[PDB]
Amino acid sequence: SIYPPETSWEVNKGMNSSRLHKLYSLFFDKSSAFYLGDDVSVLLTGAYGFQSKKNDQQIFLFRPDSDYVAGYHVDAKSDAGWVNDKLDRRLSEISEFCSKATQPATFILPFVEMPTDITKGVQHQVLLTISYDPKSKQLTPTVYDSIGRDTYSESLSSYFKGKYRTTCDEILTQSIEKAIKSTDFTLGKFTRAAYNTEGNCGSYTFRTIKEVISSSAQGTTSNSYLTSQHVQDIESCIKYRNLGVVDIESALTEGKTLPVQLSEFIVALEDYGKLRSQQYSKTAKLTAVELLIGILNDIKGKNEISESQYDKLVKEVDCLMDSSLGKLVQFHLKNLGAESLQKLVLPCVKFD
Ligand SMILES: [Ba+2]
Numbered sequence: 001s002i003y004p005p006e007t008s009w010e011v012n013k014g015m016n017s018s019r020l021h022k023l024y025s026l027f028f029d030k031s032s033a034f035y036l037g038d039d040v041s042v043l044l045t046g047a048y049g050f051q052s053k054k055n056d057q058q059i060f061l062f063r064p065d066s067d068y069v070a071g072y073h074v075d076a077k078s079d080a081g082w083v084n085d086k087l088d089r090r091l092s093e094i095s096e097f098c099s100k101a102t103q104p105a106t107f108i109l110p111f112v113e114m115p116t117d118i119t120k121g122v123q124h125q126v127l128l129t130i131s132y133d134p135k136s137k138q139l140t141p142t143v144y145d146s147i148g149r150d151t152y153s154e155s156l157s158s159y160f161k162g163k164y165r166t167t168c169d170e171i172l173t174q175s176i177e178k179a180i181k182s183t184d185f186t187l188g189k190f191t192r193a194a195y196n197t198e199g200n201c202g203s204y205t206f207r208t209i210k211e212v213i214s215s216s217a218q219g220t221t222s223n224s225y226l227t228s229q230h231v232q233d234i235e236s237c238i239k240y241r242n243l244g245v246v247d248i249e250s251a252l253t254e255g256k257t258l259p260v261q262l263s264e265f266i267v268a269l270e271d272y273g274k275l276r277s278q279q280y281s282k283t284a285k286l287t288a289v290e291l292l293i294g295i296l297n298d299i300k301g302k303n304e305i306s307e308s309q310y311d312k313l314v315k316e317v318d319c320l321m322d323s324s325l326g327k328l329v330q331f332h333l334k335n336l337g338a339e340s341l342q343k344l345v346l347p348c349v350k351f352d
Helices: 017-028 085-100 158-163 169-179 201-218 228-240 245-254 262-278 282-301 307-321 323-334 341-345
Strands: 039-041 047-052 058-062 069-072 081-083 105-115 124-133 138-145 191-194
Touching: 017 201, 017 228, 017 245, 039 245, 047 201, 058 201, 069 169, 081 085, 081 169, 085 105, 085 169, 105 201, 124 201, 138 169, 138 201, 201 228, 228 323, 262 282, 262 323, 282 307, 282 323, 282 341, 307 323, 307 341, 323 341
Parallel strands: 058 105, 069 105, 138 191
Antiparallel strands: 039 047, 047 058, 069 081, 105 124, 124 138
16 A cells, blocks of 8 residues: 655666556646646546546546456457456446446546567557547547557567467457447547657556546657656656555545655655665665665654764765765755755754
8 A cells, every 4th residue: 555665766777557657647747747736536346547638528547456457369260358357347347337428528547568478478558548429429448558569570460460470459359349239339440550679668557547537638750759757757656655555546546646754755765775785885885774764754853853863974075976876865965855855855954
Protein backbone atom coordinates (compact mmCIF):
# COMPACT_ATOMS: atom_id res chain seq x y z
CA SER A 1 0.00 0.00 0.00
CA ILE A 2 3.15 2.16 -0.12
CA TYR A 3 5.23 2.86 -3.24
CA PRO A 4 8.71 3.42 -1.85
CA PRO A 5 11.36 5.70 -3.40
CA GLU A 6 13.31 3.47 -5.74
CA THR A 7 16.53 5.39 -5.87
CA SER A 8 18.75 4.34 -8.76
CA TRP A 9 15.67 3.49 -10.87
CA GLU A 10 16.62 5.51 -13.97
CA VAL A 11 13.77 4.46 -16.45
CA ASN A 12 15.35 1.34 -17.88
CA LYS A 13 14.64 -1.28 -15.30
CA GLY A 14 11.23 -0.86 -16.89
CA MET A 15 7.80 -0.23 -15.45
CA ASN A 16 5.60 -2.30 -13.28
CA SER A 17 2.04 -1.68 -12.19
CA SER A 18 3.04 -0.18 -8.80
CA ARG A 19 5.44 2.37 -10.32
CA LEU A 20 2.84 3.30 -12.94
CA HIS A 21 0.22 3.86 -10.25
CA LYS A 22 2.76 6.03 -8.43
CA LEU A 23 3.25 8.08 -11.62
CA TYR A 24 -0.49 8.77 -11.62
CA SER A 25 0.34 11.20 -8.78
CA LEU A 26 1.70 13.63 -11.42
CA PHE A 27 -1.68 14.24 -13.10
CA PHE A 28 -2.49 17.08 -10.70
CA ASP A 29 0.97 18.41 -9.92
CA LYS A 30 0.65 21.84 -11.49
CA SER A 31 4.37 21.92 -11.98
CA SER A 32 4.30 18.84 -14.16
CA ALA A 33 4.58 18.10 -17.85
CA PHE A 34 1.77 15.64 -17.13
CA TYR A 35 -0.67 18.14 -15.54
CA LEU A 36 -4.36 17.78 -16.47
CA GLY A 37 -6.44 21.01 -16.06
CA ASP A 38 -8.62 19.47 -18.81
CA ASP A 39 -10.47 17.07 -16.53
CA VAL A 40 -12.36 17.45 -13.24
CA SER A 41 -13.10 14.57 -10.87
CA VAL A 42 -16.54 12.97 -11.40
CA LEU A 43 -19.19 11.95 -8.85
CA LEU A 44 -17.04 2.26 -11.82
CA THR A 45 -14.71 -0.04 -9.80
CA GLY A 46 -10.96 -0.11 -10.38
CA ALA A 47 -10.99 3.09 -12.35
CA TYR A 48 -10.70 6.77 -11.48
CA GLY A 49 -13.40 9.00 -13.00
CA PHE A 50 -12.83 12.26 -14.83
CA GLN A 51 -15.26 14.88 -16.14
CA SER A 52 -14.31 17.07 -19.10
CA LYS A 53 -13.89 20.76 -18.66
CA LYS A 54 -14.61 22.15 -22.11
CA ASN A 55 -16.63 19.06 -23.05
CA ASP A 56 -19.37 16.50 -22.51
CA GLN A 57 -16.82 13.68 -22.59
CA GLN A 58 -16.35 11.34 -19.60
CA ILE A 59 -12.96 9.69 -18.99
CA PHE A 60 -12.28 6.59 -16.92
CA LEU A 61 -8.71 5.64 -16.18
CA PHE A 62 -8.13 2.27 -14.66
CA ARG A 63 -5.72 1.71 -11.80
CA PRO A 64 -2.86 -0.36 -13.29
CA ASP A 65 -2.88 -4.00 -12.11
CA SER A 66 -0.45 -6.97 -12.10
CA ASP A 67 -3.28 -9.03 -13.54
CA TYR A 68 -4.11 -6.78 -16.50
CA VAL A 69 -2.24 -9.17 -18.80
CA ALA A 70 -2.66 -10.93 -22.16
CA GLY A 71 -0.52 -13.83 -23.31
CA TYR A 72 -0.32 -14.67 -27.01
CA HIS A 73 1.12 -17.68 -28.79
CA VAL A 74 3.78 -16.66 -31.34
CA ASP A 75 3.24 -19.92 -33.13
CA ALA A 76 0.18 -19.49 -35.27
CA LYS A 77 -0.51 -23.18 -35.11
CA SER A 78 -1.31 -22.63 -31.49
CA ASP A 79 -4.30 -21.35 -29.68
CA ALA A 80 -4.18 -17.59 -29.98
CA GLY A 81 -3.63 -17.31 -26.26
CA TRP A 82 -5.39 -15.87 -23.21
CA VAL A 83 -6.37 -12.87 -21.06
CA ASN A 84 -6.56 -12.74 -17.20
CA ASP A 85 -10.07 -13.21 -16.08
CA LYS A 86 -9.57 -9.87 -14.31
CA LEU A 87 -9.01 -8.04 -17.58
CA ASP A 88 -11.98 -9.87 -19.02
CA ARG A 89 -13.99 -8.74 -15.93
CA ARG A 90 -13.01 -5.14 -16.44
CA LEU A 91 -14.03 -5.46 -20.11
CA SER A 92 -17.44 -6.78 -19.16
CA GLU A 93 -17.79 -4.22 -16.41
CA ILE A 94 -17.07 -1.59 -19.03
CA SER A 95 -19.82 -2.84 -21.34
CA GLU A 96 -22.23 -3.12 -18.39
CA PHE A 97 -21.43 0.48 -17.62
CA CYS A 98 -21.85 1.72 -21.17
CA SER A 99 -25.26 0.09 -21.59
CA LYS A 100 -26.61 2.40 -18.87
CA ALA A 101 -24.45 5.45 -19.77
CA THR A 102 -25.90 8.53 -21.48
CA GLN A 103 -22.79 10.71 -21.70
CA PRO A 104 -20.04 9.41 -24.08
CA ALA A 105 -17.00 7.81 -22.45
CA THR A 106 -13.37 6.81 -23.01
CA PHE A 107 -11.82 3.93 -21.03
CA ILE A 108 -8.11 3.56 -20.36
CA LEU A 109 -6.39 0.28 -19.31
CA PRO A 110 -2.69 0.08 -19.02
CA PHE A 111 -2.03 -3.62 -19.53
CA VAL A 112 0.80 -5.98 -20.36
CA GLU A 113 1.26 -8.10 -23.45
CA MET A 114 3.52 -11.14 -23.62
CA PRO A 115 4.47 -14.23 -25.63
CA THR A 116 3.83 -17.58 -23.93
CA ASP A 117 5.60 -19.88 -26.40
CA ILE A 118 9.02 -18.30 -26.01
CA THR A 119 10.66 -19.02 -22.70
CA LYS A 120 11.88 -15.42 -22.58
CA GLY A 121 9.50 -13.53 -20.37
CA VAL A 122 9.24 -10.54 -22.64
CA GLN A 123 6.60 -8.47 -20.91
CA HIS A 124 5.49 -5.47 -22.93
CA GLN A 125 3.80 -2.49 -21.27
CA VAL A 126 1.00 -1.39 -23.59
CA LEU A 127 -2.27 0.64 -23.53
CA LEU A 128 -5.86 -0.25 -24.27
CA THR A 129 -8.50 2.39 -24.89
CA ILE A 130 -12.17 1.82 -25.51
CA SER A 131 -14.33 4.75 -26.49
CA TYR A 132 -18.12 4.55 -26.38
CA ASP A 133 -20.58 6.77 -28.17
CA PRO A 134 -24.21 6.39 -26.96
CA LYS A 135 -25.91 7.98 -29.98
CA SER A 136 -24.15 5.48 -32.23
CA LYS A 137 -24.05 2.79 -29.55
CA GLN A 138 -20.50 2.41 -30.92
CA LEU A 139 -17.59 0.83 -29.08
CA THR A 140 -14.20 1.34 -30.67
CA PRO A 141 -11.04 -0.30 -29.22
CA THR A 142 -7.49 0.82 -29.94
CA VAL A 143 -4.23 -0.53 -28.63
CA TYR A 144 -1.35 1.88 -28.35
CA ASP A 145 1.98 0.18 -28.75
CA SER A 146 5.36 1.72 -28.06
CA ILE A 147 7.60 -0.59 -30.03
CA GLY A 148 6.59 0.57 -33.45
CA ARG A 149 9.05 -1.42 -35.49
CA ASP A 150 7.51 -2.26 -38.86
CA THR A 151 10.92 -1.88 -40.41
CA TYR A 152 10.95 -2.65 -44.11
CA SER A 153 14.00 -4.88 -43.58
CA GLU A 154 12.56 -6.78 -40.60
CA SER A 155 8.95 -6.83 -41.80
CA LEU A 156 7.09 -10.10 -41.40
CA SER A 157 6.13 -11.37 -44.85
CA SER A 158 2.38 -12.03 -45.15
CA TYR A 159 2.95 -15.78 -45.35
CA PHE A 160 5.02 -15.64 -42.18
CA LYS A 161 2.38 -13.40 -40.62
CA GLY A 162 0.39 -16.55 -41.19
CA LYS A 163 3.07 -18.64 -39.50
CA TYR A 164 3.79 -16.22 -36.59
CA ARG A 165 1.80 -13.89 -34.34
CA THR A 166 3.47 -10.67 -33.33
CA THR A 167 0.77 -9.57 -30.90
CA CYS A 168 -2.29 -10.54 -28.94
CA ASP A 169 -4.62 -8.64 -31.16
CA GLU A 170 -6.41 -11.91 -31.97
CA ILE A 171 -7.09 -12.92 -28.37
CA LEU A 172 -7.82 -9.40 -27.20
CA THR A 173 -10.35 -8.69 -29.96
CA GLN A 174 -11.89 -12.05 -29.12
CA SER A 175 -12.23 -10.95 -25.47
CA ILE A 176 -13.91 -7.69 -26.37
CA GLU A 177 -16.41 -9.45 -28.58
CA LYS A 178 -17.18 -11.90 -25.84
CA ALA A 179 -17.97 -9.02 -23.55
CA ILE A 180 -20.43 -7.84 -26.15
CA LYS A 181 -21.98 -11.19 -26.86
CA SER A 182 -25.39 -9.60 -26.59
CA THR A 183 -24.93 -8.10 -30.04
CA ASP A 184 -26.39 -5.11 -28.27
CA PHE A 185 -23.55 -2.82 -29.41
CA THR A 186 -21.68 -2.23 -32.64
CA LEU A 187 -17.91 -2.81 -32.22
CA GLY A 188 -15.97 -0.36 -34.34
CA LYS A 189 -12.82 -1.39 -36.19
CA PHE A 190 -10.17 -2.52 -33.76
CA THR A 191 -7.02 -0.66 -34.71
CA ARG A 192 -3.58 -0.86 -33.21
CA ALA A 193 -1.61 2.36 -33.12
CA ALA A 194 2.15 1.88 -33.00
CA TYR A 195 5.11 4.26 -32.76
CA ASN A 196 8.73 4.83 -31.74
CA THR A 197 15.43 0.95 -25.84
CA GLU A 198 12.75 -1.66 -25.08
CA GLY A 199 12.58 -0.82 -21.37
CA ASN A 200 11.36 2.65 -22.30
CA CYS A 201 7.99 1.15 -23.36
CA GLY A 202 6.20 1.75 -20.06
CA SER A 203 7.13 5.38 -19.54
CA TYR A 204 5.96 5.97 -23.11
CA THR A 205 2.69 4.31 -22.15
CA PHE A 206 2.25 6.68 -19.25
CA ARG A 207 2.85 9.68 -21.50
CA THR A 208 0.31 8.32 -23.94
CA ILE A 209 -2.20 8.00 -21.10
CA LYS A 210 -1.85 11.77 -20.64
CA GLU A 211 -2.31 12.36 -24.40
CA VAL A 212 -5.32 10.03 -24.60
CA ILE A 213 -6.95 12.02 -21.84
CA SER A 214 -6.05 15.45 -23.23
CA SER A 215 -7.17 14.52 -26.73
CA SER A 216 -10.40 13.12 -25.27
CA ALA A 217 -11.22 16.43 -23.56
CA GLN A 218 -10.41 18.36 -26.69
CA GLY A 219 -10.66 15.83 -29.48
CA THR A 220 -8.04 14.41 -31.81
CA THR A 221 5.05 14.62 -33.01
CA SER A 222 7.88 13.80 -35.35
CA ASN A 223 9.85 12.61 -32.36
CA SER A 224 10.59 12.93 -28.69
CA TYR A 225 7.31 14.12 -27.24
CA LEU A 226 8.56 12.08 -24.35
CA THR A 227 10.20 15.27 -23.27
CA SER A 228 13.15 15.27 -20.97
CA GLN A 229 11.05 17.26 -18.58
CA HIS A 230 8.59 14.37 -18.82
CA VAL A 231 11.42 12.00 -18.00
CA GLN A 232 12.79 14.18 -15.20
CA ASP A 233 9.27 14.13 -13.72
CA ILE A 234 8.88 10.33 -13.99
CA GLU A 235 12.40 9.57 -12.72
CA SER A 236 12.15 11.95 -9.80
CA CYS A 237 8.75 10.56 -8.81
CA ILE A 238 9.67 6.86 -8.97
CA LYS A 239 13.14 7.52 -7.57
CA TYR A 240 12.80 10.03 -4.79
CA ARG A 241 9.34 9.97 -3.17
CA ASN A 242 7.46 7.69 -0.81
CA LEU A 243 3.78 7.46 -1.70
CA GLY A 244 1.02 5.52 0.02
CA VAL A 245 -1.73 4.13 -2.18
CA VAL A 246 -4.34 5.87 -0.05
CA ASP A 247 -2.51 9.13 -0.86
CA ILE A 248 -2.76 8.53 -4.61
CA GLU A 249 -6.38 7.42 -4.41
CA SER A 250 -7.30 10.51 -2.45
CA ALA A 251 -5.28 12.64 -4.88
CA LEU A 252 -7.08 11.37 -7.98
CA THR A 253 -10.53 11.51 -6.42
CA GLU A 254 -10.30 14.92 -4.75
CA GLY A 255 -8.26 16.30 -7.66
CA LYS A 256 -5.45 17.48 -5.36
CA THR A 257 -1.69 17.58 -5.83
CA LEU A 258 0.40 15.67 -3.30
CA PRO A 259 3.12 17.93 -1.80
CA VAL A 260 6.42 16.38 -0.80
CA GLN A 261 6.53 15.79 2.95
CA LEU A 262 9.77 15.85 4.92
CA SER A 263 9.33 12.20 5.83
CA GLU A 264 9.60 11.47 2.10
CA PHE A 265 13.10 12.96 2.04
CA ILE A 266 13.99 10.93 5.13
CA VAL A 267 12.81 7.58 3.71
CA ALA A 268 14.48 8.35 0.38
CA LEU A 269 17.75 8.87 2.25
CA GLU A 270 17.40 5.65 4.20
CA ASP A 271 16.72 3.59 1.11
CA TYR A 272 19.62 5.24 -0.69
CA GLY A 273 21.59 4.20 2.39
CA LYS A 274 20.69 0.53 2.28
CA LEU A 275 21.22 0.25 -1.45
CA ARG A 276 24.55 2.11 -1.21
CA SER A 277 25.76 -0.22 1.53
CA GLN A 278 25.20 -3.10 -0.88
CA GLN A 279 27.29 -1.80 -3.84
CA TYR A 280 33.84 9.42 -2.12
CA SER A 281 34.25 6.13 -0.28
CA LYS A 282 31.27 4.06 0.75
CA THR A 283 31.79 4.66 4.46
CA ALA A 284 31.98 8.38 3.70
CA LYS A 285 28.62 8.60 1.93
CA LEU A 286 27.11 6.36 4.61
CA THR A 287 28.36 8.66 7.41
CA ALA A 288 26.92 11.65 5.53
CA VAL A 289 23.58 9.98 5.01
CA GLU A 290 23.43 8.85 8.64
CA LEU A 291 24.25 12.29 10.02
CA LEU A 292 21.70 13.95 7.75
CA ILE A 293 18.89 11.54 8.55
CA GLY A 294 19.57 12.26 12.21
CA ILE A 295 19.29 15.99 11.70
CA LEU A 296 16.02 15.69 9.75
CA ASN A 297 14.49 13.43 12.35
CA ASP A 298 15.41 15.90 15.04
CA ILE A 299 13.75 18.56 12.93
CA LYS A 300 10.78 16.30 12.55
CA GLY A 301 10.66 16.01 16.29
CA LYS A 302 10.41 19.79 16.19
CA ASN A 303 13.58 19.87 18.23
CA GLU A 304 16.27 22.39 17.29
CA ILE A 305 19.46 21.02 15.72
CA SER A 306 22.47 21.61 18.00
CA GLU A 307 24.98 24.09 16.65
CA SER A 308 27.47 21.22 16.90
CA GLN A 309 25.25 19.03 14.71
CA TYR A 310 25.26 21.84 12.18
CA ASP A 311 29.02 22.25 11.95
CA LYS A 312 29.01 18.44 11.58
CA LEU A 313 26.67 18.83 8.62
CA VAL A 314 28.94 21.43 7.00
CA LYS A 315 31.64 19.04 5.60
CA GLU A 316 28.94 16.56 4.84
CA VAL A 317 27.55 19.27 2.53
CA ASP A 318 30.28 18.47 0.03
CA CYS A 319 29.70 14.77 0.59
CA LEU A 320 25.90 15.04 0.14
CA MET A 321 25.86 17.18 -2.98
CA ASP A 322 27.96 14.64 -4.88
CA SER A 323 26.37 13.05 -7.95
CA SER A 324 23.44 10.68 -7.34
CA LEU A 325 22.98 11.35 -3.62
CA GLY A 326 23.29 14.97 -4.64
CA LYS A 327 20.43 14.72 -7.11
CA LEU A 328 18.21 13.13 -4.44
CA VAL A 329 18.97 15.87 -1.94
CA GLN A 330 18.48 18.41 -4.75
CA PHE A 331 15.04 17.05 -5.67
CA HIS A 332 13.75 17.22 -2.14
CA LEU A 333 15.35 20.59 -1.37
CA LYS A 334 13.65 21.95 -4.48
CA ASN A 335 10.42 20.60 -3.09
CA LEU A 336 10.85 22.05 0.45
CA GLY A 337 11.74 25.55 -0.71
CA ALA A 338 15.34 25.53 0.49
CA GLU A 339 18.33 26.79 -1.51
CA SER A 340 20.75 24.55 0.44
CA LEU A 341 20.89 22.15 3.34
CA GLN A 342 22.64 24.90 5.25
CA LYS A 343 19.69 27.15 4.45
CA LEU A 344 17.01 24.58 5.43
CA VAL A 345 18.70 23.75 8.72
CA LEU A 346 19.84 27.23 9.68
CA PRO A 347 16.58 28.06 11.34
CA CYS A 348 15.52 25.92 14.34
CA VAL A 349 19.09 25.62 15.57
CA LYS A 350 19.96 26.29 19.22
CA PHE A 351 23.09 28.39 19.53
CA ASP A 352 25.60 28.24 22.37
BA1 LIG B 1 -9.93 -15.75 -19.74
